[PDB]
Design a protein around this ligand. Structure first.
Ligand SMILES: NC(=O)c1ccc[n+]([C@@H]2O[C@H](COP(=O)([O-])OP(=O)(O)OC[C@H]3O[C@@H](n4cnc5c(N)ncnc54)[C@H](OP(=O)(O)O)[C@@H]3O)[C@@H](O)[C@H]2O)c1
Ligand SMILES: NC(=O)c1ccc[n+]([C@@H]2O[C@H](COP(=O)([O-])OP(=O)(O)OC[C@H]3O[C@@H](n4cnc5c(N)ncnc54)[C@H](OP(=O)(O)O)[C@@H]3O)[C@@H](O)[C@H]2O)c1
Ligand SMILES: [Cs+]
Ligand SMILES: [Cs+]
Ligand SMILES: [Cs+]
Ligand SMILES: [Cs+]
Ligand SMILES: [Cs+]
Ligand SMILES: [Cs+]
Ligand SMILES: [Cs+]
Ligand SMILES: [Cs+]
Lengths: 226, 239, 239, 226
């Protein structure tokens, strides 16, 4: 019994390339009103773009405001914005660790916090964080990345336990290797950006209403374990 | 880009009532060719029914043959056929334990194994097992049910590790408390008591389970294998 | 402060060889009163043996009675009795599936259920199930074994949720590749092949499994219930 | 077949009170050489104390050095040092989030990184991080705490995948409610500091050699789930 479609105001952070762009274009094809953040490179044709560095809480504030004026308060937030700085643990610096934590984990916090008020008050919110298989699988040479992506799971679950009663859910999509090593992947191939985008499409839809606190692996089976 | 829809040959076990019927109706409205199993009562209008008890390996074989002849070999299998025989461990009998294991876990095996050849051969398969939050969350008085539903996760993961290379995936949907006839038959003590453990602070609907199955049966689900997707309002979060 | 040691009445199923024997010897050196089950070969010197097939509920009952008479009712149960019947899913029979389920999963139920009254009554119980990394990691060609070992996790968690209030806990030890006679019987293709997936880059020993069981049977383990402890050199990490 | 005891040089961060003190005193009773960090309050009688704020990478450096001079390079590191700053997500500040991340997660990184060289070269290391049930269970009003404690799991698993081959393991102990709410706990009681300390004792022993990347819950069953 399929629920009627609702055009949601969407913000995809880092929505101008790779996986974020694929998500942005898919959600736009689904019928949503899609805004993206970026910083310098520019937004894709058709979609509303706003400049944000997610390490800047004030810049995150006036991005949401700019989006609210353009297409209504963010109802679906897709936190994709991140980066890596891999190294052997012994080789890894305080600076390299903190820069990845600040962008990937604290940056996710900044957008989630900014999103929360309007979602709580309108009794609707979908926070969808793009994590990684690395979070709970443990890829070597990414103590910073893995900490950030596991941390977003913890963050999302705390939010889910607090805000699900207000119809504000928080879920993580955990992509494996995505073409934007093969021995570890049962499917014996990398995934496509469209394969990540299709899962986000599902999480942003009326069909995902009773899913909250979930980590959905999109990794051809790579991340299976405990 | 959204992948073009493909009408798939679908079998839903226990698809004649409750969650299974909600799943089967949704999959049929999606555009798939939907068959359901039942144990005599029949299948409802607009669904091809095949009679099978999933504890009977020979009956499972014949059911798949009747489906293949009607609508083509099974491409999407939804294994929903379930039952429970709850008791305190101290009280639980070998009979109660084995009965639930045979239907829920070995029955899931029977239908998966019967499906596999054709799915491997055609390089397309979606096995979707309806599990339970109980599997990894631990509900008391459910040693048999919890064992069966955790068992299907193990089974689905071994299958995913083996056959994902052939475009045959195996996933589990793990519903929490869903409003059915049986959940809404017990008094408000256990029902209100359960809401305390659900961050959503409400029961789920059969349609909300059906919506997730629809996703997993769609073209958008191709790179998900060995996943357990909880549909439980957050109830089952943990490790 | 380290809690004072208590000599516990211990039953280790499948405690006459391999990992089970390593466990039983360690528990006996720890200071416990250790009994082992076997299926005829006998128990080794310094261990009280009781003959039982864990597919036989009546034999399980009699084994526990013989243990109770010898050394007091079972306080610490180590359920190790296991077997595998590996095959491609396509190849796997109902017989191979049900056989492994009955011994590994229902057999674990039988011994747990027989243990429970006495443990609940005396307000002390430690059930320790020897599982497998395979349960949640997914090893190919192990649909039956993986289902059984994931199933014991579900079972142990339901038991933990029910009986933890009575100081009766239920935990799982999930070994990875451990050097036994059977792992060291296959050629170096599968053995070296497995090392690639183990961060430790070596096989584990029976003693390393026994050491974890010792911890879980000790007074230091009182607030651990429903846990799965992997002893696998990191092999099974994931979700 | 119990392996012979080895007296290890131990550093417990935040080892002067609550759970950290219980761990420190237990590891000392086990026969290890036990050092603790603190900051102002002082160390317990008998045990070597060093002043460190784990947000200070240079202070972490000269603590390890001071310990190495006193009792040999750290062979077992117990990262306990942390803190909370709970709030509703909407109520939670960038400052509150970052202070908990910096102390609990980045602080764990600082000590692990500093420990890594000597452990790798001596082909022995045991890193034991004190996490929390909150990491994967998702306690409301601790988006910062839960992010930090889930993040340490990811961090530990990345380290485990890199360094386990060198006999350097990384494991997390995840305590539930510890007396230093009851409806969520199967055991129907809180745990004791000694109950946490006993698990750390096990992880620091010769019996834990083949455990790496593990999260061991010490929570009376509270945290069960997925
Ligand atoms: P939900 O929570 O709404 O589920 P539910 O109401 O409990 O229904 C369980 C479903 O599984 C089927 N089922 C149970 N045991 C079976 C068996 N061993 N063989 C074949 N089908 C079986 C039932 O079919 P039937 O009860 O119609 O046989 C039913 O459709
Ligand atoms: P590890 O890897 O070293 O394990 P292993 O060598 O494969 O040994 C398995 C253990 O489990 C026992 N076992 C298997 N099936 C059993 C059954 N159904 N009833 C009672 N015991 C059973 C075996 O006892 P037996 O083979 O001696 O019966 C044996 O001690
Ligand atoms: Cs559009
Ligand atoms: Cs469209
Ligand atoms: Cs149709
Ligand atoms: Cs339709
Ligand atoms: Cs003894
Ligand atoms: Cs001894
Ligand atoms: Cs000492
Ligand atoms: Cs001592």
């Amino acid at each position: 019994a399929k629920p009627p479609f609702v055009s949601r105001s969407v913000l995809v952070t880092g929505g101008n390339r790779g996986i974020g762009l694929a998500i942005a274009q898919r959600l736009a094809a689904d019928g949503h009103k899609v805004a993206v953040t970026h910083r310098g490179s520019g937004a894709p044709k058709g979609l509303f773009g706003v400049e944000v560095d997610v390490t800047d809480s004030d810049a995150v504030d006036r991005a949401f405001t700019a989006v609210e004026e353009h297409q209504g308060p963010v109802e679906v937030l897709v936190s994709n914005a991140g980066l890596s700085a891999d190294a052997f643990l012994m080789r890894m610096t305080e600076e390299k660790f903190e820069k990845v934590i600040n962008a990937n984990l604290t940056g996710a916090f900044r957008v989630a916090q900014r999103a929360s008020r309007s979602m709580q008050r309108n009794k609707f919110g979908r926070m969808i964080f793009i994590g990684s298989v690395s979070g709970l699988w443990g890829i070597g040479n990414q103590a910073n990345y893995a900490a950030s992506k596991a941390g977003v799971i913890g963050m999302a679950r705390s939010i889910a336990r607090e805000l699900s009663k207000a119809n504000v859910t928080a879920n993580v999509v955990a992509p494996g290797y995505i073409d934007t090593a093969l021995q570890f992947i049962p499917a014996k191939r990398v995934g496509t950006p469209a394969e990540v985008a299709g899962v986000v499409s599902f999480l942003a839809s009326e069909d995902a209403s009773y899913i909250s606190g979930a980590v959905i692996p999109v990794d051809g089976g790579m991340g299976m374990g405990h």
